[PDB]
Design a protein around this nucleic acid. Sequence first.
RNA 1: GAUGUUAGGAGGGCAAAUCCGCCGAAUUUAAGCAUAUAAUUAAGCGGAAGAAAAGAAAAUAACUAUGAUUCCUUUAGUAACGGCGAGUGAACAAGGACCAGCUCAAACGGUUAAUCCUUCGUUUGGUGCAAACCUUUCGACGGAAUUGUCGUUGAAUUAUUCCAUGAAUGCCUUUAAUUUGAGCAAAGUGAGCAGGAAUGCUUCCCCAUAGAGGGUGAAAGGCCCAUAGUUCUUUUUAAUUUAUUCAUUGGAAUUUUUCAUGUCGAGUCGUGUUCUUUGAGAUUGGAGCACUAAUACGUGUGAUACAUUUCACAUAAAGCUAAAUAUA
RNA 2: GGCCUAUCGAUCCUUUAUAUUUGCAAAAUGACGUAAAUUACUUACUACUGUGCAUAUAGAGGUGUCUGAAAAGUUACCACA
Lengths: 147, 68, 49, 95, 211
Amino acid sequence: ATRFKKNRKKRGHVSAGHGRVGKHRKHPGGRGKAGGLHHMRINFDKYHPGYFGKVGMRHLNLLKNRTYCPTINVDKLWGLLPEEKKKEFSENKDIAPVIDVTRKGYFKVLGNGKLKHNQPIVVKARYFSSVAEKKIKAVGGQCILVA
Amino acid sequence: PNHNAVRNNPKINWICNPVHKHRELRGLTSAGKKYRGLRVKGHLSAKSRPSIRANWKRRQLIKLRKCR
Amino acid sequence: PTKIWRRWGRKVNLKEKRYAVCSSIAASGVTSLVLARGHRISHLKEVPL
Amino acid sequence: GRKSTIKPATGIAVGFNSGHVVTKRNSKRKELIKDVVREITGFSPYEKRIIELIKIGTSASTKRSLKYAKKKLGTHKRGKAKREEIQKVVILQRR
Amino acid sequence: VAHNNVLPNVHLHKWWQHRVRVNFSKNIKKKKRRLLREKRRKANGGTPIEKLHPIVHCPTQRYNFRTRLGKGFTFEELKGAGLTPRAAQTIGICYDKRRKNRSEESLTKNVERLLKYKNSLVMIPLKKNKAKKGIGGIPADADKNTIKEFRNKKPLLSIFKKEKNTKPFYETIEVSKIDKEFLAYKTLRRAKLAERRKNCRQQKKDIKFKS
RNA sequence: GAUGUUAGGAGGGCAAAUCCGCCGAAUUUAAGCAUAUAAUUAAGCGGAAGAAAAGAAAAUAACUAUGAUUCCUUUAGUAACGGCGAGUGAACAAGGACCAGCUCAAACGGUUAAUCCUUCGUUUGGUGCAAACCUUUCGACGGAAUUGUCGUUGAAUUAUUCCAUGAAUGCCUUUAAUUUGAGCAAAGUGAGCAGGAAUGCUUCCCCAUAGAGGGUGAAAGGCCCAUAGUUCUUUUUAAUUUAUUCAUUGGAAUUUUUCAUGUCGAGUCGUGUUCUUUGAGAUUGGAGCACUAAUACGUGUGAUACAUUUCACAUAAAGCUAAAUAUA
RNA sequence: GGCCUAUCGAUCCUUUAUAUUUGCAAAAUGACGUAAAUUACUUACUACUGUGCAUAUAGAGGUGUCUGAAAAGUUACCACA
C-alpha cells in the first residue's frame, strides 16, 4: 500500500496538498455530525433532507420474524420449474404443473409479469396478490391457500 | 469447613471447597443473589443475566478475524 | 505506534482460488512458458512431464 | 389468536383456528391449620376496620372498603380477595 | 461531515482500545478442538460420543416449515419407545424433563426415530463374559463372536444428522381435476375481518365450558 | 452468656495479567452549556481460581412452536432510547461450538434416632532401599442432636429384571495407542593452485528417510555436536485374554391391581414513594423508606396507565453442579 | 382580502379541529345483532364496539442577537493561547 500513496507524490511540499494558507488543522467546524442544522444545515438539507424531527407512533418490540415476507412475482413463478419439465407441460395439454412456492421458500405471490396464455398451472402459497389471483384464474390455473 | 462431620456429610460438603471463602463478599448469598439480580430471569434480566460486568464486557467487545 | 489492529490477512474467494490453481496448471502445461520460467527443459521428452 | 382443541385448524393461516394440519392429544389438614392459626392470631387492625365497614354494609361503605383495601394492600385484586375473606367471616359471624 | 458523504454510525467514542480483541488462534483452536474430541473418542474404546436428538419444529410464522435437533426425548416419547429415563441417560439419546411432547404427528415421528435407534443399537456386556438380559429396554448382552466382528467395522452414525426433504415437488395434475372457483384474496381479508366476531364467541364458549 | 498459656484445630498477610464483589470521578463531546456525553471507564477498599462467576425455568413463544448454562456467527447499528440535538442502543428466533444433572425444605417412617463426631484402639490388603503412603471391619469409652439427625420421594400389592453382596478354586495373557527422560545414528579432513590458516577455487570421489540448526583459524551434507531415522526404558488407557463353582443378605427398575390425591420457602412478593439505573418507554433492574399479600382450579408472566374477562406458558421469595469460554 | 411596492418566524413541545383511515404486540369489552340449532365449547352470517394513551393531517401558542443557546457583574491579585 505505502509505496503508491499521495504522501509519496507530495513528500517534500510543506502543507503538502492541504493548503499552505490554510495550515491544516483537525475538525475545524466541530466534531462528527454535530454541525448539522446549525452550521452544516445547507449540506444536510441538500444531501439528507428528511433527517430532522419526530415522525410516527412507536412499536416497542418489533420482532421482525412475526411479519416475515418472502415474495415472488408471477413472472418468475414458471422459472422455479426446470426447462425440460416445462417443455413436457407445454406439450401435454391434459396436465398442469403443481408449484409449491413455500416448499421453494416463498409466502406471497405478486402480480408483475406475464403468464403464457392457454396454459394452466397450480400455485400453492400463503398469500397472493389480487393481480396474481386474477392472472392465475385468467390462464385457467388454480391457486391453493396453504399453511 | 474444617470439622469432620461436615467434610464427611455429602450434603453441604461443596462449601468445604476454597472458593467459598467470603461468599457474601462475592455476593453468592441470597442477599447477594438479590442485588446482582440472579433471582430475576428472562427479558427483565436481559442486560444483567451472565453478570452485569460480563454482559457489559460482551456487548462492549469488538471482535476481529485475521482476514476480517 | 504499530498495533495488532492492522489488516494483515485478506479474504481470497473460492471461485478465484480454483481458477488460479486451474490456470496455473494449464500454464505449467505450456512448454515455452516452462523454459521462460527458467527450467532447463532441453533434454525433456514430453510437454507436461 | 388461538388454534382451538375442539374443531381442527383451517389451512388458511390467518384468523382464528387456522394454520398447518395437526392433531393434539389433550383441602382439609391445611384448612384446619388456618382456622387454628386464626384463633391464635385474630384479625389485623385494617382487616378489623374492613369488617366494620362491611358490617355497616352500605353501597358507600362497600365502595370505600374496596378503595381502602386497594390502598392498604396494593392492587384491586388483592383488595377484592381480602373483601371476600371478610364477607365469609361476616357470614360466619351472623350464624 | 461534508459533500456527498453519508452520516457515520461508529461507536468508537468510548475507550474501545482496551475493549477490542483480534483472533489469531482460530485454525490452531480448531485443531485443538479436533484433537480433544478425537482423544476422547479413542479413550472410550473408539465407541460413539455423539448425542441423538429428537426432531423438533422451528418456531413462528417464518420457520414453521423447518425442523431441527431438539433438547431431549422426554417421558411420553420414551414411554412410547419403551425406554426408561435411566436407560436414556445410559444410551446416546438426548435427555430432558420439561420439553412437552406436544402433537401426535411429532410424537409418532420421534418414537419411530427412537425405535430406529433401539433396533440399531448393540450393547457391549457390562462385566465382559457374564452376559444377561438386563434392564431399561436396553438390548440383551451381545455374544463374543458378533461383538468382535462388529468392533472391526465402522459405526453407522448417519441418523444423527438432519434429514433432507422432497427433491422436485413439480408434480403433474390433470386439467379436469382442478378448478377456477377460488378467491384467495377475498378469503384472506374476510378471515382477518371475522376474527373479532369469533374471538368474542370463543370467550363466551370458554365461559360456558368453565361453568 | 462469661472465664481458661485447659486439649485439639482454623483465620490473619502477600502476590494480581486474566476472574469475582463493592465503592466510585473528571479531563473529554456537543465547535458555548445545564440534560445527555466520557462511563455504570480510571482511581479507592475487599474476595477468588487455574480458569472464575453463571446454570436446570416464578423461561421464550403465539408456531406444525421451543425447552439448564457458557461461547461464537447473527439479529443490529435494528426495535428502542435522546435539549428525538449532539448522541446512545438491546433481546428473541436461526446456523453452530459444546451440553449433565440434581438436593435441601415441606410431605412420609416411632413396640423405640434407623443418626453424627472426638479419644482409645484393632486387622484384610498393596507399594518403596528407606522414609512412608495407601486400602480395611471391628469393638469399646466419651460426648453431640430430638428446639430434628438419618432413611423415604405418594401408598401398598403383583409379576418380571438387574445391581450390590460373601467363600473356595481358577486367572492377570498378549498387544496396540499415548507420553517422558534415554541412547545409537550416512560419506573425504582426497589431489592440485593461490592463501596467516579453508569450510575458497578447481578436480577426482561419494552419502542422504540426515542438503534443519549451531560450533569449527574465510562460504562445510562427508570436521564436531546436532538433525532425519530407529532401539529401548517412562506416563496412562484402550483393546484382547479366563473364569468356575458354593453362600447368605440387601437394594433398585419397570409391570399389574387396588388406594393418597396430600404437597410447593413472608416484613418476602406486591403496591406506594423516594434516589439510582437501563432498552423500559404513564418505571427495566437496584436500593432506602412506608403500607404490606395469596396459597396451588393458587400467583408470577405474556414490554402503554387502567378496569372487566379469556387463553397459552411458568412455578419466586432455599441450595449446588463438569464442559466448551477468557487470560498484557 | 386590502390600487401596487411593507405589516413577519424552524425542529421538539403544547393545544383545539378533522377521518365507512389507524395502532397500543397471544386474545376479547356493539350485541349473544340477525338467523337457524337446542343433549352443547352447536352452527352460520353481520361496514359502523370500553376508559386512557399513541398517531396521521390542519391551524394556533415563539423564538425582534428575527435560517431559532434557558444566561448578570467583576479583576490595579491574575494566568494562558
